[PDB]
């Protein structure tokens, strides 16, 4: 494990150098052509763009500054960009450029054309245990990396996991990620994936990412999440009870892993014990996993998405196409000085 200790020590050195001196203002809007909207939200959207001089394709996340302020997301938005420009790991989407103008904030990422894990899971129904285990091992390594840097991710769900041209995962959307030594308190995340200590308004820590990994593995292997209900208040009641029913087709090793990740007592939850991530890596359900081979991307993927080239949008869906307007006057300049 010395080689793992020294890898993580080097990873932290390189993150901290970029964290302390973040890059800013590395492109501008009229360097790109707009192609298609890939997703939309409360204060921002993600567009496929093409760089006019190089011809490269990118995914550009665009946030309306005035709406960020109104939804009280200033701190979270600054978190997202400062973390994304500082990290480097095989299963994290790469931030290529960032900039701002009178109206908007922009984060320009590599474009991953295979689509969201959500689409593929819902089309096929459920993943076999080896298929789920291939994806789960990538998230285990990514959380080991993020947590060693004192980062909590806080938005694990199938919609945020993109599948690349080799069938591996690229994690996207750091809107709720935060550097945290100790506890933190914000209510955020999707209802089906929230740990009990978030719902109960406690000070919580990185163990909430390991709870969310339990939810994700269950959903990949069953086809639906463990605390499913029609409205959030009913979901929250099932989460805090912790009663979980497992389908009969689950293996005994899978049920045992999930009982330890979906542990309502955070001081007993796998990932948060004295042996840290190794209680997960050494569990019987991962016995066939070569952790080094996954990191080096040398395992053949269970599934390669169908797409025609780096500009193909066929694995994403259709949204109304709205203008990208930039006001003649600067909005919210002070609030976003550091961006």
Ligand X SMILES: c1cc(-c2nnc([C@H]3CCNC3)o2)ccn1
Show which residues are catalytic: 155
Complex with ligand X: residue 25 or 186, whichever CB lies closer: 186
Asked if residues 170 and 115 have their Cβ atoms less than 8 Å apart, the reply is no
Q: Which of residues 180-219 bind ligand X (CB under 6 A)?
A: 186
CA distance 140 to 135: 9
List the one residue out of 305, 286, 254, 293 whose CA is nearest residue 117: 305
What does the CA dihedral 139, 140, 142, 144 come to, rounded to 10 degrees?
A: 160
Q: Which of residues 22-61 bind ligand X (CB under 6 A)?
A: 38-39, 46, 59, 61
Complex with ligand X: residue 98 or 263, whichever CB lies closer: 98
Helices (H), the chain: 2-20, 65-70, 74-84, 117-124, 129-148, 196-199, 207-222, 232-241, 252-261, 278-281, 291-295
Complex with ligand X: residue 189 or 271, whichever CB lies closer: 189
Does 173 bind ligand X (CB under 6 A)? Our answer is yes
| Annotated binding-site residue? 159 | yes
Does 72 bind ligand X (CB under 6 A)? Our answer is yes
Does 330 bind ligand X (CB under 6 A)? Our answer is no
Complex with ligand X: residue 162 or 177, whichever CB lies closer: 162
Distance of closest approach, residue 332 Cβ to ligand X, in angstroms: 16
| Annotated binding-site residue? 90 | no
Distances (CA, A) of 89 to 34, 206, 214, 228, 313: 28, 19, 22, 32, 25
Q: Which of 92, 93, 152, 254 binds ligand X (CB under 6 A)?
A: 93
Which amino acids are annotated as binding site for ATP, given as ranges?
A: 38-46, 61, 110-116, 157-160
What is the binding site for ligand X (CB under 6 A)? 38-39, 46, 59, 61, 72-73, 75-76, 93, 109, 111-112, 116, 159-160, 162, 172-173, 186
């Amino acid at each position: 494990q010395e080689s793992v200790k020294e890898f993580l020590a080097k990873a932290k050195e390189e993150f901290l150098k970029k964290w302390e001196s973040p890059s800013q203002n590395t492109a501008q809007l009229d360097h790109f052509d707009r192609i298609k909207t890939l997703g939309t939200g409360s204060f921002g959207r993600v567009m496929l763009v093409k760089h006019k001089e190089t011809g490269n394709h990118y995914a550009m996340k665009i946030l309306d500054k005035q709406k960020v302020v109104k939804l009280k997301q200033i701190e979270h938005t600054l978190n997202e960009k400062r973390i994304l420009q500082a990290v480097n790991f095989p299963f994290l989407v790469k931030l290529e450029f960032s900039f701002k103008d009178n109206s908007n904030l922009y984060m320009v990422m590599e474009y991953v054309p295979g689509g969201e894990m959500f689409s593929h899971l819902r089309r096929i129904g459920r993943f076999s245990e080896p298929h789920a285990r291939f994806y789960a091992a990538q998230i285990v390594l990514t959380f080991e990396y993020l947590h060693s840097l004192d980062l909590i991710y806080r938005d694990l769900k199938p919609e945020n996991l993109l599948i690349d041209q080799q069938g591996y995962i690229q994690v996207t959307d750091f809107g709720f990620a935060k550097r945290v030594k100790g506890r933190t308190w914000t209510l955020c995340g999707t209802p089906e994936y929230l740990a009990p200590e978030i719902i109960l308004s406690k000070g919580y820590n990185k163990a909430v990412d390991w709870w969310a990994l339990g939810v994700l593995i269950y959903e990949m292997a069953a086809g639906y999440p463990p605390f499913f209900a029609d409205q959030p208040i009913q979901i929250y009641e099932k989460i805090v009870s912790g009663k979980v029913r497992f389908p009969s087709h689950f293996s005994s090793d899978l049920k045992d892993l999930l009982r330890n990740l979906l542990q309502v007592d955070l001081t007993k939850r796998f990932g948060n014990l004295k042996n840290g991530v190794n209680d997960i890596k050494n569990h019987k359900w991962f016995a066939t996993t070569d952790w080094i081979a996954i990191y080096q991307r040398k395992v053949e993927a269970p599934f390669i998405p169908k797409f025609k080239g780096p500009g193909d949008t066929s694995n994403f869906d259709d949204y109304e196409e709205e203008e990208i307007r930039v006001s003649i006057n600067e909005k919210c300049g002070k609030e976003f000085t550091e961006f």
